[PDB]
Amino acid sequence: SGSGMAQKTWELANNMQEAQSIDEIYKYDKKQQQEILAAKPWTKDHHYFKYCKISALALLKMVMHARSGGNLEVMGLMLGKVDGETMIIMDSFALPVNAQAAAYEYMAAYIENAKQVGRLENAIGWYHSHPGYGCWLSGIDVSTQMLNQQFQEPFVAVVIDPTRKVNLGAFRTYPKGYKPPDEGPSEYQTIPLNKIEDFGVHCKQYYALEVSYFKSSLDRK
Ligand SMILES: N#Cc1ccc([C@H]2[C@@H](O)CCCc3cncn32)c(-c2ccccc2Cl)c1
Ligand SMILES: [Zn+2]
Numbered sequence: 171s172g173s174g175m176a177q178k179t180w181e182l183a184n185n186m187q188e189a190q191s192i193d194e195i196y197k198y199d200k201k202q203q204q205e206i207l208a209a210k211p212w213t214k215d216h217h218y219f220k221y222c223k224i225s226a227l228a229l230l231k232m233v234m235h236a237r238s239g240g241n242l243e244v245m246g247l248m249l250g251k252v253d254g255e256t257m258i259i260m261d262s263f264a265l266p267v268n269a270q271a272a273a274y275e276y277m278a279a280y281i282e283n284a285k286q287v288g289r290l291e292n293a294i295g296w297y298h299s300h301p302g303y304g305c306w307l308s309g310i311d312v313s314t315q316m317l318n319q320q321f322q323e324p325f326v327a328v329v330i331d332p333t334r335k336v337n338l339g340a341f342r343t344y345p346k347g348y349k350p351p352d353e354g355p356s357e358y359q360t361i362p363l364n365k366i367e368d369f370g371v372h373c374k375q376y377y378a379l380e381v382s383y384f385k386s387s388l389d390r391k
Pocket of ligand 1: 243245298299300308310311314315
């Protein structure tokens with residue numbers, strides 16, 4: 171008696187509670203992100219961030235863009251958020267002249283599209299390719315990333331080599347005049363002779379983040 175109607179109501183309750191849960195999670199993430207963004211811990215610690223988690227969707231799009239330029243460098247922007255000492259990259263878009271209003275209005279539509287599925291994301295960094303010479307920051311890249319870690323903070327610099335296996339680097343510049351201790355050669359990389367000077371000189375003005383990769387529930391399609 172009312173067994174059929176009970177099943178429908180139970181399904182409806184299950185669906186209504188999922189939506190409410192999604193909204194609650196988004197709102198908790200938003201306030202938790204507004205907390206750290208107003209706190210700015212990265213301004214005091216210079217080795218604050220240590221990890222970079224990249225979604226398979228963001229990697230797919232970045233590698234596709236990188237390949238499309240062939241021998242020529244390519245760049246774009248990354249969407250994500252902060253989680254303690256970890257920079258999370260969830261999505262990315264290619265770049266791209268009156269003004270870069272397009273790069274600003276694209277960014278807003280990605281955040282909005284993600285909001286609909288209950289995903290909290292914002293501009294977290296920039297990516298670019300080094301076709302054939304490896305993952306590191308050139309002198310021009312270090313000057314760019316130092317300025318980014320002033321005006322665009324929190325901001326990460328991803329470098330992809332689409333020619334040679336999983337050749338991706340995630341980096342953070344140190345501030346002008348900051349002398350850090352210890353040694354950081356980590357993984358060995360074969361870079362050309364005509365780039366080794368630019369490499370070795372600036373190779374201490376920044377550091378590498380520990381890159382990890384993840385597939386989200388939404389990043390399965
Ligand atoms: N913001 C910033 C910015 C800074 C530098 C570059 C270029 C520049 O140095 C030229 C040599 C190759 C290079 C290797 N790494 C960086 N670059 C770029 C750049 C500009 C157009 C297309 C692709 C990129 Cl990657 C952007
Ligand atoms: Zn570069």
